[PDB]
Design a protein around this ligand. Structure first.
Ligand SMILES: [Mg+2]
Ligand SMILES: [Mg+2]
Ligand SMILES: [Mg+2]
Ligand SMILES: [Mg+2]
Ligand SMILES: [Mg+2]
Ligand SMILES: [Mg+2]
Ligand SMILES: [Mg+2]
Ligand SMILES: [Mg+2]
Ligand SMILES: [Mg+2]
Ligand SMILES: [Mg+2]
Ligand SMILES: [Mg+2]
Ligand SMILES: [Mg+2]
Ligand SMILES: [Mg+2]
Ligand SMILES: [Mg+2]
Ligand SMILES: [Mg+2]
Ligand SMILES: [Mg+2]
Ligand SMILES: [Mg+2]
Ligand SMILES: [Mg+2]
Ligand SMILES: [Mg+2]
Ligand SMILES: [Mg+2]
Ligand SMILES: [Mg+2]
Ligand SMILES: [Mg+2]
Ligand SMILES: [Mg+2]
Ligand SMILES: [Mg+2]
Ligand SMILES: [Mg+2]
Ligand SMILES: [Mg+2]
Ligand SMILES: [Mg+2]
Ligand SMILES: [Mg+2]
Ligand SMILES: [Mg+2]
Ligand SMILES: [Mg+2]
Ligand SMILES: [Mg+2]
Ligand SMILES: [Mg+2]
Ligand SMILES: [Mg+2]
Ligand SMILES: [Mg+2]
Ligand SMILES: [Mg+2]
Ligand SMILES: [Mg+2]
Ligand SMILES: [Mg+2]
Ligand SMILES: [Mg+2]
Ligand SMILES: [Mg+2]
Ligand SMILES: [Mg+2]
Ligand SMILES: [Mg+2]
Ligand SMILES: [Mg+2]
Ligand SMILES: [Mg+2]
Ligand SMILES: [Mg+2]
Ligand SMILES: [Mg+2]
Ligand SMILES: [Mg+2]
Ligand SMILES: [Mg+2]
Ligand SMILES: [Mg+2]
Ligand SMILES: [Mg+2]
Ligand SMILES: [Mg+2]
Ligand SMILES: [Mg+2]
Ligand SMILES: [Mg+2]
Ligand SMILES: [Mg+2]
Ligand SMILES: [Mg+2]
Ligand SMILES: [Mg+2]
Ligand SMILES: [Mg+2]
Ligand SMILES: [Mg+2]
Ligand SMILES: [Mg+2]
Ligand SMILES: [Mg+2]
Ligand SMILES: [Mg+2]
Ligand SMILES: [Mg+2]
Ligand SMILES: [Mg+2]
Ligand SMILES: [Mg+2]
Ligand SMILES: [Mg+2]
Ligand SMILES: [Mg+2]
Ligand SMILES: [Mg+2]
Ligand SMILES: [Mg+2]
Ligand SMILES: [Mg+2]
Ligand SMILES: [Mg+2]
Ligand SMILES: [Mg+2]
Ligand SMILES: [Mg+2]
Ligand SMILES: [Mg+2]
Ligand SMILES: [Mg+2]
Ligand SMILES: [Mg+2]
Ligand SMILES: [Mg+2]
Ligand SMILES: [Mg+2]
Ligand SMILES: [Mg+2]
Ligand SMILES: [Mg+2]
Ligand SMILES: [Mg+2]
Ligand SMILES: [Mg+2]
Ligand SMILES: [Mg+2]
Ligand SMILES: [Mg+2]
Ligand SMILES: [Mg+2]
Ligand SMILES: [Mg+2]
Ligand SMILES: [Zn+2]
Lengths: 117, 112, 140, 101, 150, 59
RNA sequence: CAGGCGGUAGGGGAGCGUUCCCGAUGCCGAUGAAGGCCGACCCGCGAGGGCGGCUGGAGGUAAGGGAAGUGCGAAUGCCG
RNA sequence: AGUGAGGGCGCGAGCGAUAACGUCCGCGUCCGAGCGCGGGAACAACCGAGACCGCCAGCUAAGGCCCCCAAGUCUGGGCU
RNA sequence: GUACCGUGAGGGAAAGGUGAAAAGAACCCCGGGAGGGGAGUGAAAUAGAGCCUGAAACCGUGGGCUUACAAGCAGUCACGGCCCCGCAAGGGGUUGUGGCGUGCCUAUUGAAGCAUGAGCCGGCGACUCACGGUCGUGGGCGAGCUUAAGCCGUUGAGGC
């Protein structure tokens, strides 16, 4: 029995060019140029999920830090208060009431100042 | 309501003729006539015929009146290609691609 | 839950003075004031820093033998295109540039940095046309 | 009034009548859960060290789900190594009823 | 069926290299490992054969579906007559049957049924025995069957 | 001449980008003051044969 | 409950899909087969399988098994 | 089965000119196959560390904490 | 075994499909025609003869988002804007700024490599079969196991 290629080879090229929509020029038109481009975007995904994680942390720290310096002290200390003060809030919520509820954060500088020494 | 004419298998290269069709898109019917009547390009002729055969189809088949017409849209699709060998130096040969067009014109009544 | 993103700002204007301040160590704070990393909601991808006005930029001071041992360079494009410019050569000629230029080198390069540099206004002497905006005597 | 809470690895700022979603918990699609306050701000302010000693957020487990696909994809060039994995993450939607205390 | 020739030279053409157009890399060229003719048969161990034969026969015997006839009155050549005799065994067509007998007449009467397969006694084989829901066997056909196995 | 040659297929977006200037410009025209038909300036209107208000050729 | 899970040459395992056969005098099908175009939906780790809408207009082939011209992106590949 | 073209760095020797990103052995390691991740600006094999998938959560590692660029223009004693 | 190519011996293509029925589009209009517009046939004319289905590259017209102080393996993670589908919450398309980012294959001690291959797309394309071995293995029989050619039967029946 002979089994000609038929539907199969095209169907699989279809499945790709679907994913490749939005790509510039031939990266969305040719299969062979889409699949390359997709590979790349594939690893870029992965590795950026990770990177995204530290980059929101990164942001938060700046904002916490920026809030702190309005109350004289920096961030590098502001932590050490909080840490030996037994508080356990994370940076996201820290940078939250930082922006949103300044009176609570400003309260949090107190426990910190009182503690660190 | 819109009228439509299409001339197919016109033995002239779409690139060249499209240049013309672009000059009259959206223009009034009377506008276009003069623009074609005095365009220094071979295309115009062909474009004109369709444009005139378009107008006729308007009044004689689609009920609409002559003095309201305009190029609602017009385009040039390409068609088959007469392929012909041109002999080159050192006995190599080429292929001359003699293209062809499918000109269309869509005429429309200016409402009001 | 998602991180707060600021809506549109009403950027604070700032006057800052420059007699006696060290060239560099002043600039670095302009730069952070420029970026707006001093503000509690600072966002990396937006103009939302501060407007900065500088008076007495002539009066800027620098240690060492910098005052004429430092040389700024500029590349004209041609063969022999490198021009070399001493420090005060620059000063008493275009005092403005000296602090001006030490800051651009502290702002991120590309579209946003270029925009942020734009908000910095630098002047020799004690004068500035911006009574309009009523700039604040920021006193770092 | 608000509260910080901590369920599943992380922390969130709740509030009564919030549609929030965390990780796959265990109460059947309709039960309840007491969830620990790390700090109870609001009009009051209560800082937890680590945790506020009495306060508690009762939340209504709405139901459980699976997040949209994620195409984990890997590829090393000139070795022809390529893998494709798909990931639907499970979760739970919580109705924030009230903040105790 | 082509020329043996090198279609162009080896080097300096600029085109890739090639041999004769018969090369399976071309269109029209040969097949690489295309199916020649073959003999898909093998000798099954004669013992395993007859062991399968019984095993299948008795399987039906367990199901009850095996019926032993010793005579068919109404049949002689026409189908209708086999069809009326069928009623006795409760052979209505609600179940496919393997009709085994020596009597050519009976075979000829019933073969034209969809729900029935005719068969000479020697022709008993495990295939036909399994594709059929039932089994109906002439008393002395069953003789040779037994005589066959051991 | 060692016979120069294109390095890379000129991209779609790059060729059309070149043809930015190719577009035609419609003829410039004026009514013939008698026949009001369309005609290019400074030429004798082919509809009647008038220019400068005088019949010039017997169209 | 505890622990393992980077990986080329390579070894082992488990799968999906194409063609044809038994299942088939069967079942599906003009109340629309195959193929084609979409999808932001369901299932699977994936290869894939379904579902729905437009096209198309006569074929298709189950559970369970079988046998191969069975899966392309590169061969200065071959044909267009 | 594949392999029988290895390479770099540390150390120990021969060769070389106490030349080479040299060469050849020995003992280690890593790249090879970890051109996946953090530092070293960049930088296969140097320092940190062996990536199953997910997280807008926490501690550290080398390296750093004036702005580009996350963290001290930290504190106490000196020298240039 | 033709066109066509070779003095020649010899080489050697591509080219199937309207529809059940030709009912193959009279007639009018535009045009030199070609080709279109109505009209008519048909179940369908997006079945019109360049005729079933009609993929992909390739070329257009219309629309949405978009771009003229910004340096780029063309992606990606985030935020925002605009335009659609939606109770909702959401979701689709686009992309402004920001973060990050050394194509694919092969050869390689080592490649983004200024080393090889590929203009793009569709189709054809490479570990088979026969005899003989040798391991594992699923079964039959077991101090035994097994038939070959062939003969009898049969027309997908097997038995000697
Ligand atoms: Mg903490
Ligand atoms: Mg209209
Ligand atoms: Mg006219
Ligand atoms: Mg009327
Ligand atoms: Mg600073
Ligand atoms: Mg000096
Ligand atoms: Mg000179
Ligand atoms: Mg300016
Ligand atoms: Mg003054
Ligand atoms: Mg319940
Ligand atoms: Mg309450
Ligand atoms: Mg021959
Ligand atoms: Mg020969
Ligand atoms: Mg070539
Ligand atoms: Mg050929
Ligand atoms: Mg074979
Ligand atoms: Mg009965
Ligand atoms: Mg039979
Ligand atoms: Mg022009
Ligand atoms: Mg079948
Ligand atoms: Mg059938
Ligand atoms: Mg129906
Ligand atoms: Mg349908
Ligand atoms: Mg289909
Ligand atoms: Mg479907
Ligand atoms: Mg529906
Ligand atoms: Mg349509
Ligand atoms: Mg079938
Ligand atoms: Mg099967
Ligand atoms: Mg495939
Ligand atoms: Mg290639
Ligand atoms: Mg070449
Ligand atoms: Mg080439
Ligand atoms: Mg060719
Ligand atoms: Mg060996
Ligand atoms: Mg060897
Ligand atoms: Mg070694
Ligand atoms: Mg070594
Ligand atoms: Mg020495
Ligand atoms: Mg790197
Ligand atoms: Mg990787
Ligand atoms: Mg590294
Ligand atoms: Mg490496
Ligand atoms: Mg290991
Ligand atoms: Mg340390
Ligand atoms: Mg940094
Ligand atoms: Mg100091
Ligand atoms: Mg110190
Ligand atoms: Mg002290
Ligand atoms: Mg001849
Ligand atoms: Mg016929
Ligand atoms: Mg008549
Ligand atoms: Mg005529
Ligand atoms: Mg006609
Ligand atoms: Mg018609
Ligand atoms: Mg009709
Ligand atoms: Mg149809
Ligand atoms: Mg349509
Ligand atoms: Mg065609
Ligand atoms: Mg014709
Ligand atoms: Mg298009
Ligand atoms: Mg367009
Ligand atoms: Mg750009
Ligand atoms: Mg760059
Ligand atoms: Mg708009
Ligand atoms: Mg829209
Ligand atoms: Mg939409
Ligand atoms: Mg980096
Ligand atoms: Mg190797
Ligand atoms: Mg080579
Ligand atoms: Mg080349
Ligand atoms: Mg090629
Ligand atoms: Mg070429
Ligand atoms: Mg190809
Ligand atoms: Mg043997
Ligand atoms: Mg054995
Ligand atoms: Mg035994
Ligand atoms: Mg025994
Ligand atoms: Mg015995
Ligand atoms: Mg025997
Ligand atoms: Mg028979
Ligand atoms: Mg047969
Ligand atoms: Mg026998
Ligand atoms: Mg015999
Ligand atoms: Zn006139």
């Amino acid at each position: 029995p002979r089994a000609k290629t038929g539907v199969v080879r095209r169907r699989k090229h279809k499945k790709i060019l679907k994913l490749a929509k939005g790509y510039w020029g031939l990266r969305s038109k040719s299969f062979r140029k889409a699949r390359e481009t997709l590979f790349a975007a594939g690893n870029y995904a992965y590795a950026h999920r990770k990177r995204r994680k530290r980059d929101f942390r990164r942001l938060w720290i700046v904002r916490i830090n920026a809030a702190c310096r309005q109350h004289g002290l920096n961030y590098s200390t502001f932590i050490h208060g909080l840490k030996k003060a037994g508080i356990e809030v994370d940076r996201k919520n820290l940078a939250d009431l930082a922006v949103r509820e300044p009176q609570v954060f400003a309260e949090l500088v107190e426990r910190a100042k009182a503690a660190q020494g | 309501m819109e009228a439509k004419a299409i001339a197919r298998y016109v033995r002239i290269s779409p690139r060249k003729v499209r240049l013309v069709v672009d000059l009259i898109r959206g223009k009034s019917l009377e506008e276009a006539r003069n623009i074609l009547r005095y365009t220094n390009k071979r295309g115009a002729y062909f474009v004109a015929k369709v444009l005139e055969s378009a107008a006729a189809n308007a009044v004689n088949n689609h009920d609409m009146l002559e003095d309201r017409l305009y190029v609602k849209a017009a385009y040039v699709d390409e068609g088959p290609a007469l392929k012909r060998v041109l002999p080159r130096a050192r006995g190599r040969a080429d292929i001359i691609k003699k293209r062809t067009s499918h000109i269309t014109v869509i005429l429309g009544e200016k409402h009001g | 839950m998602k991180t707060y993103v600021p809506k549109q700002v009403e950027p604070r204007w700032v006057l800052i003075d420059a007699e006696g301040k060290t060239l560099g160590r002043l600039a670095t704070k302009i730069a952070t004031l420029l970026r707006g990393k001093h503000r509690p909601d600072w966002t990396p991808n937006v103009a939302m820093g501060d407007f900065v006005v500088v008076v007495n930029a002539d009066k800027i001071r620098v240690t060492g033998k910098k005052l004429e041992q430092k040389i700024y360079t500029r590349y004209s494009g041609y063969p022999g295109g490198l021009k070399k410019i001493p420090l005060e050569k620059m000063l008493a000629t275009h005092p403005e540039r000296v602090l001006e230029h030490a800051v651009k080198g502290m702002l991120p390069k590309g579209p946003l940095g270029r925009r942020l540099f734009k908000r910095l206004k630098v002047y020799a002497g004690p004068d500035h046309p911006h009574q309009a905006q009523r700039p604040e005597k920021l006193e770092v | 009034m608000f509260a910080i809470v901590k369920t599943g690895g992380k922390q969130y700022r709740v509030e009564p009548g919030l549609k929030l979603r965390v990780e796959k918990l265990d109460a059947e699609p309709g039960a309840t859960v007491e969830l620990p306050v790390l700090l109870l701000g609001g009009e009051k302010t209560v800082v937890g060290t680590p945790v506020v000693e009495g306060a508690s957020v009762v939340a209504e487990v709405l139901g459980h789900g699976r997040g949209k696909k994620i195409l984990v994809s890997k590829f090393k060039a000139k070795v022809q190594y390529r893998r494709k994995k798909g990931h639907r993450q499970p979760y739970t939607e919580l109705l924030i009823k009230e903040i105790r205390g | 069926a082509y020329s043996g020739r090198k279609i162009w030279p080896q080097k300096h053409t600029g085109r890739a290299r090639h041999g004769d157009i018969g090369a399976p890399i071309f269109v029209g060229g040969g097949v690489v490992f295309g199916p020649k003719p073959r003999d898909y048969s093998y000798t099954l161990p004669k013992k395993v054969r007859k062991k399968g034969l019984a095993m299948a026969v008795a399987d039906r015997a367990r199901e009850g579906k095996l019926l032993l006839v010793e005579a068919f009155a109404g049949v002689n050549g026409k189908t209708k007559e086999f069809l009326a005799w069928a009623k006795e065994a409760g052979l209505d067509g609600s179940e496919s049957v393997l009709l085994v007998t020596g009597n050519e007449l009976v075979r000829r009467a019933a073969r034209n049924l969809p729900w029935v397969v005719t068969l000479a006694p020697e022709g008993l084989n495990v295939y036909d025995i399994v594709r059929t829901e039932r089994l109906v066997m002439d008393l002395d056909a069953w003789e040779v069957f037994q005589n066959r196995i051991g | 001449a060692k016979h120069p040659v294109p390095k890379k297929k000129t991209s779609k977006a790059r060729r059309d980008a070149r043809r930015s200037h190719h577009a035609l410009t419609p003829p410039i025209l004026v009514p013939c003051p008698e026949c009001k038909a369309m005609k290019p300036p400074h030429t004798v209107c082919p509809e009647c044969g008038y220019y400068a208000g005088r019949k010039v050729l017997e169209v």
